Design an enzyme around this catalytic site. Structure first.
Site, mmCIF file in Angstrom:
data_model
loop_
_atom_site.group_PDB
_atom_site.id
_atom_site.type_symbol
_atom_site.label_atom_id
_atom_site.label_comp_id
_atom_site.label_asym_id
_atom_site.label_seq_id
_atom_site.Cartn_x
_atom_site.Cartn_y
_atom_site.Cartn_z
ATOM 1 N N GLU A 42 0.822 -1.225 0.000
ATOM 2 C CA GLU A 42 0.000 0.000 0.000
ATOM 3 C C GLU A 42 0.842 1.254 0.000
ATOM 4 O O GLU A 42 0.458 2.269 -0.603
ATOM 5 C CB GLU A 42 -0.947 -0.009 1.199
ATOM 6 C CG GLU A 42 -2.071 -0.991 1.015
ATOM 7 C CD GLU A 42 -3.342 -0.655 1.778
ATOM 8 O OE1 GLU A 42 -3.301 0.294 2.622
ATOM 9 O OE2 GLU A 42 -4.368 -1.365 1.508
ATOM 10 N N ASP A 99 -5.265 12.434 0.406
ATOM 11 C CA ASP A 99 -5.561 11.179 -0.286
ATOM 12 C C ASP A 99 -6.252 11.478 -1.619
ATOM 13 O O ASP A 99 -6.201 12.610 -2.094
ATOM 14 C CB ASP A 99 -6.408 10.246 0.585
ATOM 15 C CG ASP A 99 -7.757 10.828 0.968
ATOM 16 O OD1 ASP A 99 -8.163 11.886 0.443
ATOM 17 O OD2 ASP A 99 -8.429 10.195 1.810
ATOM 18 N N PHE A 140 -7.784 -4.759 4.394
ATOM 19 C CA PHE A 140 -7.367 -3.366 4.156
ATOM 20 C C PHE A 140 -7.633 -2.965 2.698
ATOM 21 O O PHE A 140 -8.035 -1.830 2.405
ATOM 22 C CB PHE A 140 -5.909 -3.167 4.488
ATOM 23 C CG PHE A 140 -5.644 -2.830 5.922
ATOM 24 C CD1 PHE A 140 -5.786 -1.536 6.383
ATOM 25 C CD2 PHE A 140 -5.233 -3.782 6.796
ATOM 26 C CE1 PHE A 140 -5.549 -1.235 7.690
ATOM 27 C CE2 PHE A 140 -4.982 -3.464 8.114
ATOM 28 C CZ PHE A 140 -5.160 -2.213 8.553
ATOM 29 N N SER A 153 -13.053 -19.770 -1.602
ATOM 30 C CA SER A 153 -11.641 -19.637 -1.295
ATOM 31 C C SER A 153 -11.426 -19.577 0.228
ATOM 32 O O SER A 153 -10.480 -20.179 0.742
ATOM 33 C CB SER A 153 -11.056 -18.387 -1.960
ATOM 34 O OG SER A 153 -11.056 -18.507 -3.372
#
Ligand SMILES: *CCC(=O)Nc1ccccc1CN(C(=O)Nc1cccc(C(F)(F)F)c1)C1CCN([C@H](C)CCC)CC1
Length: 363
Positions: free
Chosen positions: A23, A32, A116, A129
């Site tokens: 990230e 941001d 996240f 999964s």
């Protein structure tokens, strides 16, 4: 309590270091993708438009007056609070708690990474999964995860996370770090491991098939958020390649045209343009040396500033940051005959004088 010493019993690789790669980590307050002041690994400070407000929030969280700049260790402390919140949320989620409970620490970090990136609902959509993971069917889990839109959106990151599920090791991150260390070592200063010296910057440009004086090289410096033109640190190099998602010169080469395209947005060009002053100016020197200013102006304003040739002639017959910044505002507003210039507009004297200088030529 939040002291990282309390974590010294853990492995040195951890979820913070994982997300630092996947990230990215910023040690200075930035905005941001929305308007909002953020720091560290995606830690929102406030939605206030006031930087002083963001700084106030940051000082409270860190416990000192930071003036908007923190250390990596302080970023880790902020991040650990965010991770603890995320994990509590996972434990509240009936679809995620069972698989989280079943996983070992390394694979838990991969699951938290997913959360996240895409949030709980996103991760909870991967029902099959997640069941394979809970059954420790690692290879089938990996195959199934690779079939997803997630894989298409962020292939480098997604491959690393899937590898972490497949193996229960940090191999994907170890391998990436080594690959970048081995590339970095091609450029490092023989006299200082943690810098790329004049030969190294030249070599980097050569490897990219770029002239060191080209605007492309300045654009890379901008994207690497390099502090200064006569230094290039290991941290800048590593953090830049990581941010750009490049593990080789071939990949960086492929990014360069995408960087150039970014400058078509007036907002991004203004950032680039203002960056250039900071990057160009010798540290300590109070303003930018005129000849250096001219050199960089000819690079970054060619094709934007209609009077660049006259500007050269004028200056040939030290620049503070405010004057540098305002030339772009002048370039953008000024009519082709300068008829809309407002001499009561508090432009620098340099620009007032230029407009006087330039009117025989327009006549
Ligand atoms: C400052 C000493 C020096 O010239 N060093 C050097 C050697 C070889 C090639 C470039 C440079 C300095 N420049 C530069 O862009 N450095 C740089 C620093 C950090 C990161 C990067 C990166 F990522 F590779 F882009 C590069 C250039 C500075 C300015 N000159 C001319 C005068 C520009 C024309 C306006 C070009 C070299």
């Amino acid at each position: 309590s939040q002291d990282l010493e309390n974590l010294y019993f853990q492995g040195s690789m951890n979820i913070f270091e994982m997300l630092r790669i996947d990230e990215g980590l910023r040690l200075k307050i930035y905005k941001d993708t929305e308007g909002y002041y953020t720091i560290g690994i995606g830690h929102l400070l406030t939605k206030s438009p006031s930087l002083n407000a963001a700084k106030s929030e940051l000082d409270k969280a860190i416990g000192r007056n930071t003036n908007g700049v923190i250390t990596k260790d302080e970023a880790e402390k902020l991040f650990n609070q965010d991770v603890d919140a995320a994990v509590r949320g996972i434990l509240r989620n009936a679809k995620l708690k069972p698989v989280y409970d079943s996983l070992d620490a390394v694979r838990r970090a991969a699951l938290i990474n997913m959360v996240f990136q895409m949030g709980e609902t996103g991760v909870a959509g991967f029902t099959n999964s997640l069941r394979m993971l809970q059954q420790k069917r690692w290879a089938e889990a990996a195959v199934n995860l690779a079939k997803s839109r997630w894989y298409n959106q962020t292939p480098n990151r997604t491959k690393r996370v899937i590898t972490t599920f497949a193996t229960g090791t940090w191999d994907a991150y170890k391998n990436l770090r080594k690959k970048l260390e081995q590339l970095y070592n091609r450029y490092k200063d023989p006299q200082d491991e943690n810098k790329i010296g004049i030969d190294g910057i030249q070599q980097f440009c050569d490897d990219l098939a770029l002239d060191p004086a080209s605007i492309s090289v300045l654009i890379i410096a901008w994207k690497f958020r390099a502090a200064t033109q006569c230094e290039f640190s290991k941290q800048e190099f590593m953090d830049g390649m990581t941010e750009l998602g490049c593990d080789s010169i071939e990949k960086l080469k492929a990014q360069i045209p995408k960087m150039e395209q970014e400058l078509k947005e007036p907002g991004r060009f203004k950032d680039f343009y203002q960056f250039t002053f900071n990057f160009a100016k010798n540290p300590g020197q109070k303003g930018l040396d005129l000849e250096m200013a001219i050199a960089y102006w000819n690079l970054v304003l060619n094709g934007r500033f209609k009077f660049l040739d006259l500007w050269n002639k004028f200056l040939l017959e030290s620049i503070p940051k405010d004057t540098w910044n305002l030339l772009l505002d002048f370039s953008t507003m000024i009519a082709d005959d300068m008829s809309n210039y407002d001499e009561e507009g508090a432009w620098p004297v340099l620009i007032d004088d230029f407009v006087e200088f330039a009117r025989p030529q327009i006549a």
